[PDB]
Amino acid sequence: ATFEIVNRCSYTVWAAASKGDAALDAGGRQLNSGESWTINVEPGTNGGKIWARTDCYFDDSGSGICKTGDCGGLLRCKRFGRPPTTLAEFSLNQYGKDYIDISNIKGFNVPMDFSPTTRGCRGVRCAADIVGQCPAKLKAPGGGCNDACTVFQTSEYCCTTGKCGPTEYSRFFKRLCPDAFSYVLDKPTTVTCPGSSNYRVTFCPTA
C-alpha cells in the first residue's frame, strides 16, 4: 500500500511511521512546509501508525530529540512516539478489508486528515484547534495537548481494567473532534475500506 504524507503546516514537521516493533518504510523524515513523502507499507500490516513530530533536532547519525512524538531519539522511528501525538492508525488486509482511524487517545499535537486516495470509503479528520483550547491541566509545556491517561495515570483514564467511561477530559477531545477516538472504549470511529486501498495523510489540512 502507498501512503502519501503531506505537510501543509506552515512549520516543519518530522513525520514518523511505525508498527511499534519496527519502522514502516524509512520510519521517519523531515517534511518542510509543503513537502510530500511517499512511503510503501507492506500488505497485511497490523497496528501501523503515522504521526508528526515537532521541534526536532537531529545530528548527522540521525540521533536527537523532538518536543512532541519523540521515538527514543531517532529520526527513523522503530517504535511509537511520546505523547502528545495525534495518530493516524491503520490495519491493512484484515480478512479482505482495511481499517483506518484517527485517535486522540495519546493526545493531540498537529491537526490531521487521513483519507483514501482510492475509491470505496471516506476519510476522517481532526483539524480543530485542540492545542489552543486545551484544558490547563492537559497542556504540555513542549507543545500539544496531553490525554488524561498520560497526565494522571489512573485506571479510569487509562481504562486498565477494561471498564471505564467517558470523562471530562475525554469529552473535551470528543467535542472538538467527534470523528477521532477520545478514550479507549469510545464508540468506534473506525472506517472500513476495501483491502489494499491507498491513502494520504495531511498535516494541517485546513491551516
Numbering used by the authors: 1 to 207
Please quote the authors directly:
Using lysozyme (1 × 1 × 1 μm) and thaumatin (2 × 2 × 4 μm) crystals dispersed in a cellulose matrix, we were able to collect 100,000–150,000 images in approximately 60–80 min at a wavelength of 1.24 Å. At a flow rate of 0.43 and 0.47 μl min−1, a total sample volume of about 30–40 μl was used with a crystal number density of 5.8 × 108 crystals ml−1 for lysozyme, and 4.3 × 108 crystals ml−1 for thaumatin. We indexed and integrated 30,000–40,000 images for both the lysozyme (space group P43212) and thaumatin (space group P41212) crystals. The lysozyme and thaumatin crystals yielded data sets at 1.8-Å and 1.55-Å resolution with a completeness of 100% and a CC1/2 of 0.992 and 0.988, respectively. In this study, 16% (w/v) and 22% (w/v) cellulose matrices were used for the small sized lysozyme (1 × 1 × 1 μm) and thaumatin (2 × 2 × 4 μm) crystals, respectively. The cellulose matrix with randomly oriented crystals was extruded through an injector nozzle with an inner diameter (i.d.) of 50 μm.
Serial femtosecond crystallography (SFX) using ultrashort pulses from X-ray free-electron lasers (XFELs) can overcome typical radiation damage to protein crystals via the “diffraction-before-destruction” approach. Here we introduce hydroxyethyl cellulose (cellulose matrix) for serial sample loading. We demonstrate the cellulose matrix as a protein carrier for SFX using small and large sized crystals (1 × 1 × 1 to 20 × 20 × 30 μm). In addition, we demonstrate the successful de novo phasing in SFX by applying praseodymium (Pr)-SAD, single-isomorphous replacement (SIR) and SIR with anomalous scattering (SIRAS) phasing to determine the structure of proteinase K. Furthermore, to reduce background scattering, a novel grease matrix, Super Lube nuclear grade grease (nuclear grease), was introduced in this study.
